Ligand SMILES: C[C@@H](C(=O)O)c1ccc(C2CCCCC2)c2ccccc12
Ligand SMILES: [Ca+2]
Ligand SMILES: [Cl-]
Ligand SMILES: [Cl-]
């Protein structure tokens with residue numbers, strides 16, 4: 001196995017495959033004019049392909065990922081990196097820098113189980129990035145309810161939807177993708193979501209998604225990501241979407257956020273409860289804590305409905321406003337004992353639901 | 360106690376005094392005093408004190424209280440640019456009002472707030488902010504971390520002639536920097552604790568306000584603008600850097616600092632994770648750096664340098680060398696060598712104002 005490649009042509013692929021003992025190594029393969037790099041943690045895998053325009057010899061090995069990446073990154077901008085397999089070591093040479101790395105046999109590199117694709121679609125990268133970024137923050141982290149430690153991907157009509165919840169607050173994002181889809185639902189593990197998100201480079205390469213019974217694969221440009229799905233049932237989240245909020249309030253996103261952020265300083269550190277008093281074109285926010293410190297914020301908003309009061313977790317609401325990053329927000333309300341739904345006033349694509357608190 | 364002050368006039372002082380504050384609650388509070396047309400804000404941890412004076416041009420009423428430092432800072436910082444902030448003590452609560460934002464904070468009595476002991480200044484001088492910045496950043500990285508010789512965890516500040524000098528060492532490597540300050544000083548040495556050095560750096564805003572330093576037998580104080588920092592000193596017998604500098608390191612190697620740094624940083628990848636040893640082979644106009652680890656992975660770097668005279672080999676902890684090269688921020692470095700079992704001296708090839716000494720492995 002031999003190849004010589006420019007540093008930068010190696011670094012982006014290296015970043016991608018480092019994501020997921022031999023699991024600490026990258027599989028390197030030279031075949032039919034291409035260097036492929038693979039990383040895996042047994043749950044998911046990333047493969048990156050690099051065209052080889054310089055002379056090369058086929059073969060495969062595995063090397064320590066961190067060390068190989070660090071060596072490549074540490075070399076000067078635009079350096080040519082020459083790699084050859086010599087016995088049980090992989091030799092890396094560039095200028096008068098030389099390295100000998102330990103290898104493990106390519107034959108030992110684990111493969112993900114084989115599977116059949118049953119649902120497929122192609123969409124712009126930007127659309128998938130919007131879908132994930134809109135909801136990722138609301139996934140559970142390491143809940144014993146393992147089916148929450150990930151993100152629902154739901155197809156219906158011509159729409160792809162992501163849903164995330166930690167068992168307390170909810171994020172939903174829905175986008176038309178211009179193809180007729182079967183009504184289908186899968187849960188992608190949270191680490192897979194993160195790795196998928198970070199494979200999307202913000203460019204013009206379209207993303208191809210293939211979903212099997214127990215696996216998902218995403219292909220964009222020179223990168224192929226594959227993951228197991230979470231084998232579980234996602235909660236019936238539709239039950240907490242307010243059926244008909246009769247009251248709708250519109251406010252400047254940043255003004256509302258800064259008022260909540262200031263009030264939060266004097267909210268209970270653990271339960272983070274703040275109260276909203278809604279009246280004709282006015283919102284008053286209050287907070288207090290066990291040391292009897294108190295905050296009050298009054299802002300002008302657009303609101304005509306009946307006066308009402310409602311409490312909620314200000315951390316959850318701040319998370320929502322930070323995700324929305326827009327000009328104006330719409331808060332849809334019912335009463336003091338019902339949830340609140342929050343959206344960008346200019347777009348219904350993303351929606352967030354926060355539960356009510358009594359004080 | 361009442362005042363109204365513009366947000367921007369409050370924010371820097373609040374940041375200056377509150378930054379390093381947090382099991383004794385009142386230590387988490389700032390002391391606020393309105394007296395003689397000035398708002399004074401004070402923070403302390405009992406070892407050091409930060410005091411800022413703010414002229415009150417708007418109507419105000421005298422008095423003092425203490426309030427949670429972080430909360431008051433966060434409230435002020437969270438208000439919009441240009442906000443006017445009105446404060447008044449009402450009973451045992453401190454009220455803060457700006458626009459239609461209102462806050463009521465808990466207080467502790469100003470009478471309970473702790474004072475650093477009184478002391479007398481013995482040594483005084485003034486110097487540019489830029490010089491203090493240079494003195495600290497040139498040596499700070501070489502201070503010990505949690506060493507049982509507590510004085511090594513701080514920084515020596517020495518006056519000699521008209522130079523102010525800092526020295527830092529952890530027993531394995533040493534940094535020294537000396538700068539002229541144009542005033543006849545007595546020969547004097549003090550040790551400033553770690554936290555003190557951090558605040559002494561933090562208080563330099565990068566303007567042209569000069570620093571006024573007062574040193575007593577047990578304290579140091581720095582005045583810049585309307586901020587006053589005071590720290591207790593540390594007792595102990597700091598090493599004499601004069602005795603740590605190699606007596607005659609007449610093997611002189613010159614190399615590009617960034618080239619040298621990058622070569623060591625790559626070799627370090629395949630050095631021992633705990634011990635971090637690399638070997639240097641010096642020969643005519645050439646340096647070779649090698650590293651290997653228990654797994655027998657190997658790095659080799661060869662560099663062109665300026666070196667004439669005898670060949671030698673020497674081993675170093677590569678972290679120590681990298682720390683020096685990252686602190687130098689210059690074009691060319693000079694390494695002054697003696698033999699395989701003696702320390703190396705390292706300097707900017709174009710300035711003798713700082714020197715670095717590293718023991719070999
Ligand atoms: C009815 C039940 C279910 O389908 O099993 C259910 C429904 C809805 C949710 C969340 C709660 C709050 C924010 C988003 C919806 C659940 C969360 C954890 C466990 C069960 C949940
Ligand atoms: Ca000196
Ligand atoms: Cl606001
Ligand atoms: Cl109030």
Ligand SMILES: [Cl-]
Pocket residue numbers: 098099100657658659
């Ligand atoms: Cl080698």
